[PDB]
Curated annotation (Swiss-Prot), chains A, B:
The lineage of its organism: Eukaryota, Metazoa, Chordata, Craniata, Vertebrata. It comes from Homo sapiens (Human). The gene is SFN. The keyword Phosphoprotein applies. SUPFAM superfamilies: 14-3-3 protein. Keywords: Cytoplasm, Nucleus, Phosphoprotein, Secreted, Ubl conjugation. This is 14-3-3 protein sigma. Homodimer. Interacts with KRT17 and SAMSN1. Found in a complex with XPO7, EIF4A1, ARHGAP1, VPS26A, VPS29 and VPS35. Interacts with GAB2. Interacts with SRPK2. Interacts with COPS6. Interacts with COP1; this interaction leads to proteasomal degradation. Interacts with the 'Thr-369' phosphorylated form of DAPK2. Interacts with PI4KB. Interacts with SLITRK1. Interacts with LRRK2; this interaction is dependent on LRRK2 phosphorylation.
Length: 228, 228
């Protein structure tokens, strides 16, 4: 549907939609931009991530409300409506995963792009895992793990320990361990090592970089406080 | 699209969607319920109102953000995107107005239903007026006025001055005077007379009715403080 709109116009409208808090529109504009086939800049990758994080975040919040009501109930209506929301959420995750697979990850050669997109791949498989059951659940969990692991391997080789993309990936992979993989020890170990290694590298940063890094370190700290 | 779902199931799902903050779904469920052709109870009228108030409220907020950006700008992109949001907002108002006209108002014989639906008709024409220009704007403004006026005439004859539906109608009609009709004196006069007449009738109310009435009186007071 965005085929006829200029790439630059799609990006401008994504930024307008963000200002207007119209995240579904923002996601559709950014999907349109990705579908132009050109690589995305740092700023554009962030718009893509913000758009979809907000759309799926609304769906996750609703799915949690409905799943809780359903669990307390256990007519077909609560299950039906939870399934409707679930299917829409799965559709959004599949769309994002589709964009990463066609062809963002394949064309991403710099560490900052490649780690960003692999982290996104991990996150959206993780959101699929949250609603999955049984064996289905196992292959989705391993897809999330695999994407996070490749992202981590590159991040550790190519980025300093205070790099915000590296920090956010480790944060999210630790949440995956705690919430999805039933590995709270791995979660705590990862968050603590990441935090400690970032602390030791802060002395190399400017005021503004220090601010960006320490903000994410505080999230690692918040989790560690929740988990210990 | 809701033709195949039971009326009772649509109402149950509207309530679930409200809990999940899924207002677009809530509105679609309630549109489905209205389209069953049966009158709506007090509780169901409130679900219909809440659903659409939230959907149009999001669109109004976005339209205001974009209109402000557009005014500061004065490429085609801001205007295009403001028009897109505007058209969607107009679509929602036209849908609500359509439900009231087919056939909620015509079948509504009790004061509490008839005033409720005429107030809604005033409100949705008012939202259309907010984005309208020129002469177009004049016929829409008079449609809002006419609906509010019929609602007021019934409310004054049939309801006590503390009735929350009567109070909310007067509040909204005063906002129409202030914001749409360029009649701030009429706005202030209406809010003040409504407030004073409700005050004098509070002595007749139970604790819970007193709470409901005084909450809306506080909104009239808030406006009077804003306007004077
Ligand atoms: O509240 C959270 C917290 O979850 C995290 C904490 C630390 C790292 C990663 C996550 P997330 O599970 O990727 O969102 N997530 C969340 C966010 C939204 C929002 F804000 F994007 F709309 C909505 C729903 C949820 Cl669960
Ligand atoms: O903030 C307001 C205040 O406007 C009023 C104040 C007193 C009476 C009636 C109105 P309204 O213009 O019918 O919403 N309206 C508004 C509400 C939403 C919400 F909360 F429904 F999402 C969104 C946008 C607006 Cl402008
Ligand atoms: Cl459903
Ligand atoms: Cl490459
Ligand atoms: Cl547009
Ligand atoms: Cl009648
Ligand atoms: Mg071009
Ligand atoms: Mg039931
Ligand atoms: Mg399912
Ligand atoms: Mg490097
Ligand atoms: Mg231990
Ligand atoms: Mg039936
Ligand atoms: Mg331009
Ligand atoms: Mg227009
Ligand atoms: Mg009466
Ligand atoms: Mg005067």
């Amino acid at each position: 549907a965005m085929g006829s709109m200029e790439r630059a116009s799609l990006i401008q409208k994504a930024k307008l939609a963000e200002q207007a808090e119209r995240y579904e529109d923002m996601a559709a504009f950014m999907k349109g931009a990705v579908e132009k086939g050109e690589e995305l800049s740092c700023e554009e990758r962030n718009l893509l991530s913000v758009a979809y994080k907000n759309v799926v975040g609304g769906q996750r919040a609703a799915w949690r409300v409905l799943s809780s009501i359903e669990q307390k109930s256990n007519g077909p209506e609560v299950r039906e409506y939870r399934e409707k929301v679930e299917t829409e959420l799965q559709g959004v995750c599949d769309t994002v995963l589709g964009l990463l697979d066609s062809h963002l990850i394949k064309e991403a050669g710099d560490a900052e792009s490649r780690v960003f997109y692999l982290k996104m791949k991990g996150d959206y498989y993780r959101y699929l895992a949250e609603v999955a059951t049984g064996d289905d659940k196992k292959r989705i969990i391993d897809s999330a793990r695999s994407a996070y692991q490749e992202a981590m391997d590159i991040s550790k080789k190519e980025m300093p320990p205070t790099n915000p993309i590296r920090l956010g990936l480790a944060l999210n992979f630790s949440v995956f361990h705690y919430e999805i993989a039933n590995s709270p020890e791995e979660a705590i170990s990862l968050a603590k090592t990441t935090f400690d290694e970032a602390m030791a590298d802060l002395h190399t940063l400017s005021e503004d970089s220090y601010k960006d890094s320490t903000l994410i370190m505080q999230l690692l700290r918040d989790n560690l406080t929740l988990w210990t």
